[PDB]
């Protein structure tokens, strides 16, 4: 609109300045009330030298910050099957990162690591075949290990083995919206004034993953970890970062606190 955004690949140089004794130029004087950040520059506050600065800005780009796998789910089968709802609020690290943007669009790379464990949770050197089926909302969800739904004629399935490298697939930007929302000041449905339906973007829920072992294990079970990596990231409206602990997987509910950093004896002692 009014304010333009130029593009750059290196931070700004420093150019030599000299002294100043004047009444026309007062760069140090500011007014925070305006809503603007100070615009006093290095060169104006002190006498500087020339510095050709080539320090890059690549590792702070959206793509460099978000572009790496992170844990989003971990579970074990119970009867050779397990149904997980695709939502990233279980594990806080990747969650706290995504919530730094208000809206964002991105593709994802899912990596699935599986291994067999016995009843005492001790890993076994056992190669077994496993199936991961994506069941969109409205599709019939498998009740158990051998239900008919695993024929998977339309639902996408991936079949690999605990002895093969981890499985991995890419996923497109799937929301019905034009971007995923990581903050939503509204309700899930019309005619509902209940706190249980507040702050959830239903279009952010695209289904569930149902995992099973193609054949039954005798006394052991499948231990699964799902990693997710954002790719081709586009984001809008940066947010105030999370400063208190997460409590609930599905909401941002928190416990108030009176300080963020630890106290010190005196404000005059560094």
């Amino acid at each position: 609109q009014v304010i333009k955004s130029a593009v750059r690949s290196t931070v700004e140089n420093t150019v030599q300045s000299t002294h100043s004794i004047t009444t026309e130029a007062t760069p140090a004087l500011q007014a925070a009330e305006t809503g603007a950040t100070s615009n006093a520059s290095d060169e104006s506050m002190i006498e500087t030298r020339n510095v050709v600065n080539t320090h890059g800005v690549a590792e702070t780009s959206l793509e460099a910050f978000y572009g790496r796998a992170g844990l989003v789910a971990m579970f074990s089968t119970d009867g050779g099957i397990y149904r997980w709802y695709i939502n990233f609020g279980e594990y806080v690290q990747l969650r706290a990162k995504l919530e730094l943007l208000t809206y964002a669009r991105f593709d994802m790379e899912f990596t699935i690591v599986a291994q067999v464990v016995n009843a005492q949770s001790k890993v076994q050197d056992f190669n077994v075949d496993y199936q991961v089926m994506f069941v969109p909302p409205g599709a019939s969800v498998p009740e158990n290990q051998d239900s008919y739904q695993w024929q998977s004629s339309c639902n996408p399935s991936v079949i690999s083995n605990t002895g093969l490298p981890p499985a991995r697939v890419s996923v497109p930007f799937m929301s019905s919206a034009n971007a995923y929302s990581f903050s939503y000041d509204g309700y899930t449905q019309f005619g509902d004034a209940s706190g249980s339906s507040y702050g959830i973007v239903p279009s952010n829920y695209l289904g569930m993953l149902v995992v099973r072992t193609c054949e039954d294990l005798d006394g052991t079970r499948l231990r699964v970890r799902v990693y997710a990596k954002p790719k081709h990231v586009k984001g809008w409206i940066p947010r105030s970062p999370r400063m208190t602990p997460y409590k609930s997987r599905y909401t941002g509910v928190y416990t108030d606190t009176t300080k963020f950093c630890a106290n010190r004896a005196r404000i005059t002692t560094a």
Partner: protein
């Protein structure tokens, strides 16, 4: 160097390799009236 696509959908593509930054003015100075550094802000 090589950047060629094997798969059909763009979601299969590797990470974007255009990692730059842009002017933060829309965030650091979203005001209507220009307030030059050499001037006093409130006049």
């Amino acid at each position: 160097y090589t950047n060629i696509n094997y798969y059909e959908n763009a979601a299969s593509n590797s990470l974007n390799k255009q990692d730059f930054t842009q002017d933060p003015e829309k965030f650091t100075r979203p005001v209507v009236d220009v307030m030059k550094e050499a001037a006093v802000p409130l006049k």
